[PDB]
Design a protein around this ligand. Sequence first.
Ligand SMILES: Nc1ncnc2c1ncn2[C@@H]1O[C@H](COP(=O)(O)OP(=O)(O)O)[C@@H](O)[C@H]1O
Ligand SMILES: [Cl-]
Ligand SMILES: [Cl-]
Ligand SMILES: [Mg+2]
Length: 414
Amino acid sequence: MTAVEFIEPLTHEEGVSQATKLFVDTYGAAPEGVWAAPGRVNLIGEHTDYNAGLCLPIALPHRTFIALKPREDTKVRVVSGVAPDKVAEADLDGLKARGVDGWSAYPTGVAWALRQAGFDKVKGFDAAFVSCVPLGSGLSSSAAMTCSTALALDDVYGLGYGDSDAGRVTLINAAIKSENEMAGASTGGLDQNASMRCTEGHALLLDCRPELTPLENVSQQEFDLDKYNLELLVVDTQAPHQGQYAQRRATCEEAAKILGVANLRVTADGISKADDQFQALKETLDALPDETMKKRVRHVVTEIERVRSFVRAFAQGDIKAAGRLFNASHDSLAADYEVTVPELDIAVDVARKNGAYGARMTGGGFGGSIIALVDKGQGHEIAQKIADRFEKEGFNAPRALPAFAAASASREAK
Ligand SMILES: Nc1ncnc2c1ncn2[C@@H]1O[C@H](COP(=O)(O)OP(=O)(O)O)[C@@H](O)[C@H]1O
Ligand SMILES: [Cl-]
Ligand SMILES: [Cl-]
Ligand SMILES: [Mg+2]
């Protein structure tokens, strides 16, 4: 057997060099520059973004690097190191929603979304992508691709949104619109906010209430693992990839209609404020027509409050309490939200039995990755324990990634 694999992040120099070479090898011309956007892990606050709740992601050091040059025509050519001989070409002139096939829908839909927003200066482009964000592993390769493309287009077309946090929200909404309306993948905004608004050494406490301005809806929460002698273990289970996500949103929207609220954040805040939170929840669930919907509402309400509990626990250096909150977030996703699979649940169980302060699935679920707060120096040991258990179970070998709170998207070269 081979020891469990760790996926190292591309350095600045590596990502620039590789993206530039693929661009020149593909297109002949030099790119105007290279931009990049990171993947992410959500620390806690899962299935809450589309309920107007609270989330707490970090940006991974793993980035997608885009080499880009604008075109004077409306042609879009993209290529990726995943399949470097296969250039995808589309045209923006008259392009409609779902008018692009395959991965190229993600970058092309970002230029489409900016033109739909009235950015008529945005024409076509050539791009080459090189990434170390694994595809389809619940680490947000999709946002790293759409956000890197949005920051690059904003830069070359001089739209003036990329150089401020608030201005990045315009680029975020174009990234979300690309993925929702061009690629046809429902996204709630956690991942794109992480990729373009996280900061090094911090977690992004994101308030997803849709009426808030950009300066109102984020606060940078110190997330210095070294201060507490900790490591954040991230393990991509590599469980075989899997409209269950549609059904979860639909159930939450129906719950909010029955309650007479705009969103379950309203519900959760009313329960949170009660002296008797147990009775406030019971009265809410009593209003709901069926046992499954009650489970879904119980998850979103308890999970929004766990985000505030986590932010408090971590600031107090109470790592045991922070871990317990990871644990409770996982258990809620497994039992009440029903979005776990055996690989996630067994990886988490191995982490918990091997000294993790806590461990949980991250992202949407149904596969993908787990995270665990562990003592510094224990991440390899716990990863290898998960890989040894995975082989005993007949599962695909997992892989791990080093993780700490890294920088958001940026221009890498010009
Ligand atoms: N480097 C890349 N090159 C080409 N396509 C990519 C790349 N990264 C992401 N994609 C596209 O995005 C999809 C992965 O996004 P998604 O299914 O949302 O998973 P995740 O966001 O968890 O990584 C891929 O199937 C492909 O269509
Ligand atoms: Cl046009
Ligand atoms: Cl459901
Ligand atoms: Mg995705």
